[PDB]
C-alpha cells in the first residue's frame, strides 16, 4: 500500500529483508567551501 494515498501499488512488489552497510564515505567529512584563505608561497595561488 501507498502511505500517501492509502491505495495499493498497481502491481505486487518484491519486499524482503536485506543486509545493508553504512560505508565510511560520509558527506559530513566531504562538504567544503571557501571564499578566501591561505595562498601558496611561490605562485600565490590558493592552497588545496
Amino acid at each position: 500500500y501507498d502511505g500517501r494515498t492509502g491505495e495499493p501499488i498497481e502491481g505486487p512488489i518484491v519486499v524482503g529483508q536485506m543486509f545493508i552497510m553504512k560505508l565510511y564515505h560520509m558527506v559530513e567529512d566531504k562538504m567544503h567551501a571557501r571564499s578566501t584563505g591561505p595562498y601558496s608561497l611561490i605562485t600565490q595561488q590558493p592552497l588545496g
Binding site: 611561490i42 605562485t43 600565490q44 595561488q45
Partner: protein, 47 residues
C-alpha cells in the same frame, strides 16, 4: 563596499614564468601594439 569587482590585471604566475625563463638566460619581453616594451613589474625590477 557594495561595488562591482574591478577589471583584473596580469596574474602572478605569469610573472613567475618570466623570471624563471630569465633564469635560463632567455630574454622574454612583453611588447605593445608598436613593438615597444611593456613593464609588467610596475617598475619594481628595472634598475
Amino acid at each position: 563596499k557594495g561595488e562591482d569587482v574591478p577589471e583584473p590585471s596580469v596574474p602572478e604566475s605569469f610573472r613567475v614564468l618570466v623570471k624563471e625563463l630569465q633564469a635560463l638566460a632567455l630574454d622574454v619581453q612583453t611588447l605593445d601594439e608598436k613593438d615597444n616594451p611593456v613593464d609588467i613589474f610596475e617598475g619594481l625590477a628595472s634598475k
